[PDB]
Structure formats: C-alpha cells, structure tokens
C-alpha cells in the first residue's frame, strides 16, 4: 500500500496472508469469508506469463496477522489448503478479467478478536455502495512505493472512480467485472495498492446495517500511485454467482 497508514489492531480481522512455504515469503493478500473459505485473486495463484502456477501444497494461509514478518504467537493462526478453485473464465491472457479464486481450508479456523469473516455483498448493497465518489478501504502488506516493505499491515481509503475515467486512464480493455478506485491528480490526496497487495480486499462499511462488505479484490494497475492512473479491482458482486456455486458444490 502506497501513501497509507498503519492499521489498528483488529481493524481488518478478515485480512489473510498467502504465504509461500519454500522459500518462506509473502505471496499475496486474501480475505476470510467463512470458517473454511478464503477469497483471493486468481493471478495470485495462476499467471503463466510469469511462470506462476501454485498448487495447494505450495502455500499456507496466515490469518489474524498484523506484523508482516513476525510469527505472531497466540494471535495468528496458520492453515493448510484443501483445494484451490480458479474462475474457469479467468482471463490471464489479456486483461485479468474475472480475477478471482477461492481456497478451501483443510480445517475450520477459530474466530477470535483478530480473526473474523467479512460479508459478501448482495445485489442491493452493491447497487447502493458501488458508486463513483464513495470510498472503500484497501489493506495489505505490499510495497510502500512503486520502486520498501512495511512493518505492519497498511490501510488506505480510496474513492471509487467513474467508469469512463477508469477507461480513459489506460490502454487495457476494461470489463464489467472490474472497477477502479483512487484519487485524481486534481484531488491532491493520494494512495494506491501495489505489488504484494494482490488478492487483498477492497471493503466498504454499509451505512444501512453497519457491517463491512468486500466489494473488490486487488487486481492490477500500471505502476503504483501514479498521477492519472487508478487501481483496478475485481468486482466481487458480479462474480458472486460463481462464488456461491463453488461453495454450494464443494462446501
């Protein structure tokens, strides 16, 4: 996260770290959506142009973390993966369309003050909150600058951007399965996700029921926190039918 701040303890209890077993390193962010299911970006697991193709036994999920590098004894919980599910129409060839994946844990994780699932949006919540100008929150342990790494989880609030502005900012083909967020040059304030924040959640707090909903997944961008560029996020609600199908069949 660029131009963000340190998270508060327990501020993002659904934040998940995807952790590579060998060598031991951060792979991506992700989010906890139930006691057995974790949501992330497909490109965190599969990206052939970079020779990336992780299998279940390659990875661990670390939940309840704050410190990036420390083993947070008696606080974090570490889970093994039972199975990965990548969206069958994930477009890694072109533009990361449908950049979404689920991971089922071998065993249910125990909820605590530091570990708790985020909600997924219904159609109405999405319609009401996914509007240009409305701000969401992105969190992660990714890079602090485009070209170091944070001691603890970082947070930044960013406004959703009008679709035509998103489209005009890039040469990449944008789809209905993505949205973009970030400040415009004229707005003065800044902030963005970056490398390492991939797969982490873009969340909004519903003013109707005061619950946090995950509207987006950190997906792609051109550099980080560049003037006139915006971060792109997987549109979680648009892909919710796939999410439910996977959980219904394999849960």
């Amino acid at each position: 996260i660029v131009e963000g701040s340190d998270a508060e303890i327990g501020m993002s209890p659904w934040q998940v770290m995807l952790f590579r077993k060998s060598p031991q390193e951060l792979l991506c962010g992700a989010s906890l959506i139930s006691d057995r299911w974790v949501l992330t970006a497909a490109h965190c697991l599969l990206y052939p142009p970079w020779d990336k193709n992780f299998t279940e036994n390659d990875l661990l999920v670390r939940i309840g973390k704050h410190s990036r590098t420390r083993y947070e004894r008696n606080i974090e919980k570490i889970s093994m993966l039972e199975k990965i599910y990548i969206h069958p129409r994930y477009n890694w060839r072109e533009n990361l369309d449908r950049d979404i994946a689920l991971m089922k844990l071998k065993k249910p994780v125990a909820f605590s003050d530091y570990i708790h699932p985020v909600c997924l949006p219904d159609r109405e919540t999405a319609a009401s909150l996914l509007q240009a100008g409305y701000k969401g929150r992105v969190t992660g342990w990714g890079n602090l600058k485009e070209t170091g790494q944070p001691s603890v989880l970082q947070v930044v609030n960013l406004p959703i951007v009008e679709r035509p502005v998103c489209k005009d900012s890039t040469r990449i083909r944008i789809t209905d399965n993505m949205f973009c967020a970030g400040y415009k040059p004229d707005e003065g304030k800044r902030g963005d996700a970056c490398e390492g924040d991939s797969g982490g959640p873009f969340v909004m707090k519903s003013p109707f029921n005061n619950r946090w909903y995950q509207m987006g997944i950190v997906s792609w961008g051109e550099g980080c926190d560049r003037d006139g560029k915006y971060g792109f996020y997987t549109h979680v609600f648009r892909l919710k039918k796939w999410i439910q199908k996977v959980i219904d069949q394999f849960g």
Partner: peptide, 11 residues
C-alpha cells in the same frame, strides 16, 4: 526477512 514458523505447519 520472515521469522520462521513452527515446523508443524510445514509438515
């Protein structure tokens, strides 16, 4: 860079 995790999780 990262602190070592308990061996149980790597088994």
């Amino acid at each position: 860079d990262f602190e070592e995790i308990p061996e149980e999780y790597l088994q």
